[PDB]
Amino acid sequence: NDNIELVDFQNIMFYGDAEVGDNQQPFTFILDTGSANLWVPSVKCTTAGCLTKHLYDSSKSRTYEKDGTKVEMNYVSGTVSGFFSKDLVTVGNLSLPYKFIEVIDTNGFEPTYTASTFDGILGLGWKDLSIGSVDPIVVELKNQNKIENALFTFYLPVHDKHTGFLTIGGIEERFYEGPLTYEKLNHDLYWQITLDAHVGNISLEKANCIVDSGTSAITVPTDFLNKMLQNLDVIKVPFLPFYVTLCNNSKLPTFEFTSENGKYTLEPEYYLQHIPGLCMLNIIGLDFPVPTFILGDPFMRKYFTVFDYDNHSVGIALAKKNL
Amino acid sequence: SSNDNIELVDFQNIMFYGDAEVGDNQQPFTFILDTGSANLWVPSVKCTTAGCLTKHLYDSSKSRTYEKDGTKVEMNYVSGTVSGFFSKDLVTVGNLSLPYKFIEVIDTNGFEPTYTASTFDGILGLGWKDLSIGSVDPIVVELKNQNKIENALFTFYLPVHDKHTGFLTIGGIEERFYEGPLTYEKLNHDLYWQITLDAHVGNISLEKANCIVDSGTSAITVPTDFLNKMLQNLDVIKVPFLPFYVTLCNNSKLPTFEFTSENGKYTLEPEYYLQHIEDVGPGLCMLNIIGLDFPVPTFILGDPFMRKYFTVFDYDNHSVGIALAKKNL
Amino acid sequence: NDNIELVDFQNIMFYGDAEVGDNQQPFTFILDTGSANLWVPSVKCTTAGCLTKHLYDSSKSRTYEKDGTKVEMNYVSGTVSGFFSKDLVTVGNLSLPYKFIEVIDTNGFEPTYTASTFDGILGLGWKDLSIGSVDPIVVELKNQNKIENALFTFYLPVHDKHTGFLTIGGIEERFYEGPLTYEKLNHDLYWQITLDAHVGNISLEKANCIVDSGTSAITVPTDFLNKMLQNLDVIKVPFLPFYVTLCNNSKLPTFEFTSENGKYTLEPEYYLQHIPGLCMLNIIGLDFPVPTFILGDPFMRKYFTVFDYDNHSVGIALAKKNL
Amino acid sequence: SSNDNIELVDFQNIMFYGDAEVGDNQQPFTFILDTGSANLWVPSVKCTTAGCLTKHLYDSSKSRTYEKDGTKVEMNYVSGTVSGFFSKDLVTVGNLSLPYKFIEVIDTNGFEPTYTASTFDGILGLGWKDLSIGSVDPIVVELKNQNKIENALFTFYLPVHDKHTGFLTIGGIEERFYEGPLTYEKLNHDLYWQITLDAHVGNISLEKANCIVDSGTSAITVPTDFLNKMLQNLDVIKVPFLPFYVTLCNNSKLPTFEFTSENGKYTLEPEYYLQHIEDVGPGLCMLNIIGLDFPVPTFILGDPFMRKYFTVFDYDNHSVGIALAKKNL
Ligand SMILES: CCCN(CCC)C(=O)c1cc(C(=O)N[C@@H](Cc2ccccc2)[C@H](O)CNC(C)(C)c2cccc(OC)c2)cc(N2CCCCS2(=O)=O)c1
Ligand SMILES: CCCN(CCC)C(=O)c1cc(C(=O)N[C@@H](Cc2ccccc2)[C@H](O)CNC(C)(C)c2cccc(OC)c2)cc(N2CCCCS2(=O)=O)c1
Ligand SMILES: CCCN(CCC)C(=O)c1cc(C(=O)N[C@@H](Cc2ccccc2)[C@H](O)CNC(C)(C)c2cccc(OC)c2)cc(N2CCCCS2(=O)=O)c1
Ligand SMILES: CCCN(CCC)C(=O)c1cc(C(=O)N[C@@H](Cc2ccccc2)[C@H](O)CNC(C)(C)c2cccc(OC)c2)cc(N2CCCCS2(=O)=O)c1
């Protein structure tokens, strides 16, 4: 299959490379199941941040198709803006002409953008999540008969153990062990499924759970989070929504998430980030109209995940500890 | 059959507020009345922040109908975040009252300087249930479910600075507040008060746009490409680094928005979307229009539209009615 | 003597009232020995922040003298700008015509300004510290023969025990006990004196020590601070220059400051701010070209202080625990 | 008697840099050479930040002349903060070298986005000892104390975009770099390179102003009242909310600064203080002038002044010499 290497950056985040243009101009991406647009910064971007990145030049590519529709993308960390373009996009060994955003202004995305090592973002969500009604890249590959199955998988890197892969088009056995259970999407928007959630006696039945590679935390309803952390020797840190603890804290809880078909757990080792024997919890309280858990990178580090557009499902199995 | 009229007070021809009460001792608060959200909150007497010191505060200990809940909750708005916990008590809007679940806010430090600088105490959402944190049935729906009104509908007649005052009306439609036809547009989703309209600014067209009627926003938002095209050669200027557009207040070349359905036509002339900014420049105006892109191309028809048009929000028929607001009450 | 009451605000800060104009328009001030200008917001200020404050109107005062020179004041927390004016300023029972800054713009001082309960700042430093070469108010009172001694004293409030006072013109016995030792200023700029500083075996000889009522911390050279906190069970909090600990931490150190004439100590109880049994340290690391300690509110809470312009000195004694 | 000339490279006719080395293996770095500060720092190989990944880094383990110190220190600049610790090693500036104390920087996250977006690795201060953190004797003073040069002085001949390159010179004055008289102004304090001059812009006068010559600032700063008066009726506009002033690049009504002492006269015409901002507007310029008030009324004579005037910084005679820079080297 088409494997894109996922490269750990100092155990903080992971990135993958892909190319744009028939001259294959190289970019580093966040590979984000929580979004659904592809963007790269343009040679026509002149902001401070752009001068530090790899840039796209439409003039150097023969397969460029103009669109020019203005567009702005909004993220938690800020906004980028520019215009739609179309060109050849190569992800590992596969390429296809594809619509994307050429970014001209990054000043509303700072300091994040200058302070990070990615050039752009490559969304892997569903069509209805995208600005511009862009068919997802994996769907388009399948439509243009370049892969048989419109699915992709994540096997995340683990610092100083092993690298990761985004695989497009088939499921490799080498990445997981135990049973692979598929959970049906509750909406074709995010990769969002319905699970019962428990920590000890704290529970939330039929929680909406979003599998988001673009987020390095588990997000939890604020009342659930408040209940789960009391009497634990975790310290809320003032002026910020973060929590610290002793790395060796034996009181720390395990999330359990269950469907009729599978049971998934996330122990403290997957959500603790070492920072003097002290660790931050990669868990954040967030309320939405549908009580939701965002199962970000800490969950995906434990569990290999399969994202299947043909079956409208997320497949979850234990990731193999080594490759 | 008995309309409940809540008077609306203008603020700097920009925003409007209305008052309602919480508790069986009718503790008074000034609210943003917001069709763009679906929670009610008030600041608590347990809120110690500097901002809360300037506000009317809710004291549950003074109300015999208070029912503790205590579920923690944090509300996220564009202007910031407030957090607290759920409570239940009598909520009074004009002459109608009911036991209702709301958020008692204890921290407002993530909502400054907005909150201290504003004259409201809280927000009262008037959207649909699926927009609410905590799955709270909207007040007007709950009033109808409790048999306190016949029709689950409300209307907005917005105040106009120096001209007339405004009303929120629950339970029926006052003919005195509109002229010309009243046309109803079916909701495309029961979430925002969101309808489907074709949008045109002369030359530039966007068919089947999603249009959200949002009383809690003082602007019109438009897709960024549509905005860029509409301003092309207009004697308007983008202030550098900022999302804002300025022009002489006397500019005679500004466009009219036109929105159409199969049943109706609605226009918004420059006079409804210009904001005087004399502080910045003699004869200068800000275009109160912001570009914003969503997965479905969307216009947010905020206060500027609602100051022109009387609006009817009908939960039983899942629709929005639109009619020219009476220029003199 | 002229006593201005110092009113505790939720054990976070203290403020005092004074008036401007012959109609005595009332303001709440930060009373700041670390600065040397008086400003108030003007009725001509139209920014968001000003609408929430008490404002000055020159038109309503018969003793107003125009100046109109533009000026901007810069603080750590941001900037305010406006223009010089002259009018009657009343501090307790004394008034005098005095030059001050009318503030027209507060947008560079936000969110601090809107989020606080003061209207303006009343500086109590030396002439060379002031923008505009303004003679300090206490010096001017003495020059215009309204007090005999150009000195003032601080006795700070203690939450839920007792209120505070700024006294102008004489030293009240009721405020202190033990010996009052005067330390000569090393420069007529800040109220800055030379002390040897020790924590355990960590020392800095002839440190510059600035007595600053406008600051709620002790600031310490960064290397001294790093040495003093190691092996203490204090947790540096990520992304911010703050430290937390258990309120009952018995390992916490005591600052000692010595001159040839006096010895001053500051125990953990004076620098711990309660915030779940957890306390923040009111201590911040800061390096200057002259190795400096800023003895802010935590020091002034323990020690009554006398600021004497005639003798160029700071007098320090134990503050009485109750009034 | 042997001048040490370090070549200076221009950046966007805005800033300039020069290279020097640290370690007895001459590890190379690009520096801001800053008469407005008095510390040398370089980023360490132990710096793991994203910004440091783009820079030349200092590896003490590769230098035989490295001497550990390890005193922690944090430097505060207007653009932010860097922190690390003191170290001592061979520092090489052109052909002169000496063992010298400097800061090895381990964290630059409080100095972003400035630092990653810039092409420098570190800063090399050229002010007086009392301006330094840690009481470090300035490099040029230390060179003279070690008998490596005869005169503790240095000069700046700034590069000019598309015209000529620049030099920092240590130890003597090159006649080729200036024309017209060279006039020396006595320092008013041994801290910045600060001199006393009368300032005039036609009508507007400020006597005995403190003038700081500051190579590390790309602007001229002026007292805010003086700035407000000088711009009065000029066809210049303040961009709203911002501290910035714009004008047509062709404006023929812009003023000349004049500074005078009893011995000399120095002027700065519009062409030295305008910055083209074509990105914002065709034919548009930014006035590279900022208002700033200090306890003594002060002008900071940054790069724009130094691009016009050759400057001599003399530690032995406590003075600054000023002469028109040669327009063609
Ligand atoms: C060590 C790396 C840290 N980065 C922070 C970078 C600013 C993150 O892990 C991160 C990335 C994102 C993010 O927007 N991710 C989107 C992808 C992305 C990544 C970097 C820059 C821009 C955008 C992703 O598309 C968001 N997915 C959805 C929409 C599901 C999401 C996630 C979390 C909260 C949401 O609503 C507020 C929405 C969000 C977070 N947050 C959750 C935990 C702390 C609060 S937060 O900032 O809202 C964190
Ligand atoms: C009310 C009068 C003054 N305020 C300024 C507030 C700082 C506004 O006009 C205002 C209120 C809101 C708001 O969130 N409104 C929500 C209600 C509200 C009002 C005041 C304070 C907090 C909250 C309202 O519920 C938002 N409705 C939805 C969710 C439909 C909305 C509107 C606009 C943009 C959205 O998403 C990007 C979402 C948003 C704006 N903006 C429009 C103009 C610039 C972009 S913006 O910041 O997003 C403006
Ligand atoms: C709970 C109240 C917290 N407030 C923060 C309000 C922003 C303070 O205690 C405070 C007030 C000031 C301040 O500027 N004080 C000046 C007076 C003032 C007070 C409020 C608003 C504006 C101005 C005072 O004039 C500063 N004195 C000097 C110049 C000696 C000073 C003190 C500390 C650090 C300095 O250099 C960076 C300089 C400075 C601090 N800081 C020291 C500890 C944390 C870092 S800091 O922000 O630089 C803290
Ligand atoms: C070098 C080319 C680009 N940089 C932009 C940096 C973000 C500048 O032109 C620059 C560098 C500095 C700076 O701190 N310069 C110090 C050296 C430096 C240079 C780059 C990065 C960090 C540090 C220099 O040592 C400052 N000298 C003194 C202390 C005399 C100074 C200058 C100006 C204002 C001061 O106090 C308010 C103090 C200051 C400025 N400003 C002038 C224009 C707007 C106001 S400002 O922000 O204060 C500009």
- Residue C110 belongs to domain with CATH number: 2.40.70.10
Q: Ligand 4 site: residues with CB under 6 angstroms?
A: D 15, 32, 34, 36-37, 77-79, 114, 123, 192, 212, 214, 216-219, 221, 290, 292, 300
Nearest Cα residue to atom 25 of ligand 4? D36
Which site among D107, D108, D116, D242 would you substitute to test the A interface, given the most A Cβ atoms closer than 10 Å to its Cβ?
D116
Cβ within 8 Å, pair C49-B279:
no
Nearest ligand, CA of residue B112? 2
The dihedral sign for the CA sequence B42, B48, B52, B56: positive
Q: Look up residue D58 and give its DSSP letter.
A: B
Q: Which two tokens stand for residue C12?
A: 């976070």
3-class secondary-structure state, position A316: strand
Tell me: do A6 and A127 sit in the same domain. yes
Alpha-carbon gap: C202 to the closest alpha carbon of chain B (Å):
39
Phi, psi dihedral angles at A293 (to 5 degrees): -115, 135
Which ligand 2 atom lies nearest to the CA of residue B37? Answer: 25
Tell me: do D83 and D57 sit in the same domain. yes
Q: Which two tokens stand for residue C169?
A: 């013109």
Pocket test for ligand 2, best of B31, B37, B78, B105 (most atoms within 8 A of CB): B78
Question: Using an 8 Å Cβ cutoff, are D155 and D311 in contact?
Answer: yes
Tell me: do A138 and A220 sit in the same domain. no
Chain D environment of C288 (Cβ under 8 Å): 133
Cβ within 8 Å, pair C244-A238:
yes
- Distance of CA D300 to CAs C69, C166, D224, D297, Å? 20, 38, 12, 10
Cβ within 8 Å, pair D73-C222:
yes
Cα separation, D171 vs A149, whole angstroms: 73
| Angle, CA B254 vertex, CA B251 and CA B256 arms, to 5° | 145
Distance D240 CA to ligand 4 centre (A): 22
Examine the fold and report which residue of D142, D175, D208 is the final residue of a domain before the chain moves on: D175
Which site among B242, B278, B284, B286 would you substitute to test the D interface, given the most D Cβ atoms closer than 10 Å to its Cβ?
B242
CB atoms within 10 A of CB D277: 15
Question: Using an 8 Å Cβ cutoff, are B19 and B98 in contact?
Answer: no
Place of tokens 């220190």: D73
Pocket test for ligand 4, best of D9, D79, D82 (most atoms within 8 A of CB): D79
Alpha-carbon gap: A49 to the closest alpha carbon of chain D (Å):
6
Cα separation, D182 vs D173, whole angstroms: 11
Closest CA to D293 of D227, D232, D194: D227
Ligand 2 in contact with B292 (CB < 6 A)? yes
| Backbone angle region of B5, left / alpha / beta, with phi > 0 → left and psi within -120 to 50 → alpha | beta
Tell me: do C178 and C160 sit in the same domain. no
Q: Which residues of A94-125 are buried (b: 16+ CB within 10 A; e: fewer)?
A: bbeebbbbbbbbbbbbbebbbbbbbbbbbbbb
Select the residue of D48, D53, D112 nearest A114 (Cβ to Cβ): D112
Cβ within 8 Å, pair C285-D74:
yes
Tell me: do A179 and A101 sit in the same domain. no
Full 3-state SS string of chain B: CCCEEEEEEEECCCEEEEEEEECCCCEEEEEEEECCCCCEEEEECCCCCCCHHHCCCECHHHCCCCEEEEEEEEEEECCEEEEEEEEEEEEEECCEEEEEEEEEEEECHHHCCHHHHCCCCEEEECCCHHHCCCCCCCHHHHHHHCCCCCCCEEEEECCECCCECEEEEECCCCHHHEEEEEEEEEEEEECCEEEEEEEEECCEEEEEEEEEECCCCCCEEECHHHHHHHHCCCCCEECCCCCCEEEECCCCCCCCEEEECCCCEEEECHHHHEEECCCCCCCEEEECEEECCCCCCEEEECHHHHHHEEEEEECCCCEEEEEEECCCC
Nearest ligand, CA of residue B118? 2
Q: Which residues of D touch A (CB under 8 A)?
A: 48, 50-51, 53-54, 109, 112-113, 116-117, 279
Alpha-carbon gap: C117 to the closest alpha carbon of chain B (Å):
7
Tell me: do D28 and D151 sit in the same domain. yes
Distance A32 CA to ligand 1 centre (A): 10
Nearest ligand, CA of residue C209? 3
Neighbouring chains of A at 3+ CB pairs under 8 Å are B, C, D
Cβ within 8 Å, pair A244-C236:
no
Cα separation, C99 vs C84, whole angstroms: 7
Question: Using an 8 Å Cβ cutoff, are C260 and C194 in contact?
Answer: no
> Which residues 6+ apart lie within 8 Å of B256 measured at CB?
B201, B267, B268, B269, B270
Distance C272 CA to ligand 3 centre (A): 17
Tell me: do D169 and D283 sit in the same domain. no
3-class secondary-structure state, position D307: helix
Strands B40-43 and B96-107: parallel
Cβ within 8 Å, pair D133-C69:
no
Distance D80 CA to ligand 4 centre (A): 10
Question: Using an 8 Å Cβ cutoff, are B183 and B321 in contact?
Answer: yes
| Closest-CA residue of chain A to C276 | A235
CB atoms within 10 A of CB D48: 11
Q: Ligand 3 site: residues with CB under 6 angstroms?
A: C 12-13, 30, 32, 34-35, 75-77, 112, 121, 190, 210, 212, 214-217, 219, 284, 294
Q: Look up residue C149 and give its DSSP letter.
A: S
Tell me: do C108 and C195 sit in the same domain. no
Examine the fold and report which residue of A173, A189, A207 is the final residue of a domain before the chain moves on: A173
Helix (H) or strand (E) holding A180: strand A176-188
Cα separation, D167 vs D13, whole angstroms: 15
DSSP string, D194-240: EEEEEEEETTEEEEEEEEEE-TT-SSEEE-HHHHHHHTTTSS-EEPT
| Closest-CA residue of chain B to A36 | B295
| Cβ burial, residue C321 (10 Å; 0-12/13-18/19+) | exposed
Nearest ligand, CA of residue B11? 2
Cβ within 8 Å, pair A81-B224:
yes
Active site residue B279: no
> Which residues 6+ apart lie within 8 Å of C145 measured at CB?
none
Q: What is the resolution of this structure in A?
A: 1.9
Cβ within 8 Å, pair B295-A69:
no
> Which residues 6+ apart lie within 8 Å of C34 measured at CB?
C123, C125, C190, C210, C212, C213, C214, C215, C294
Q: Which two tokens stand for residue C206?
A: 């002839």
Q: Which two tokens stand for residue D60?
A: 């003490």
Tell me how many domains chain C contains.
2
Alpha-carbon gap: A78 to the closest alpha carbon of chain B (Å):
12
Examine the fold and report which residue of C123, C147, C173 is the final residue of a domain before the chain moves on: C173
Place of tokens 């809940």: B69
Q: Look up residue C134 and give its DSSP letter.
A: P
Chain Cα centroid distance, residue D192: 11
Active-site amino acid positions of C: 32, 212
Q: Is the peptide bond before C111 cis (omega within 30 degrees of 0)?
A: yes
Tell me: do A316 and A284 sit in the same domain. yes
Experimental determination approach used: X-ray
Cβ within 8 Å, pair A10-D48:
yes
Phi, psi dihedral angles at B60 (to 5 degrees): -65, -30
Q: Which is the catalytic residue, given B89, B214, B303, B314?
A: B214
Tell me: do C281 and C198 sit in the same domain. yes
Q: Which two tokens stand for residue A52?
A: 């530090």
Neighbouring chains of C at 3+ CB pairs under 8 Å are A, B, D
Tell me: do C136 and C247 sit in the same domain. no
- Distance of CA D125 to CAs B265, D79, D95, D136, Å? 68, 16, 18, 10
Q: Which two tokens stand for residue B236?
A: 């308007």
Tell me: do D145 and D170 sit in the same domain. yes
Give the amino acid at B155: T
Q: Which residues of B touch A (CB under 8 A)?
A: 38, 71-76, 83, 130-133, 135, 224-225, 227-228, 241, 291-295
Nearest Cα residue to atom 41 of ligand 1? A215
Range of the domain at B97: 1-175
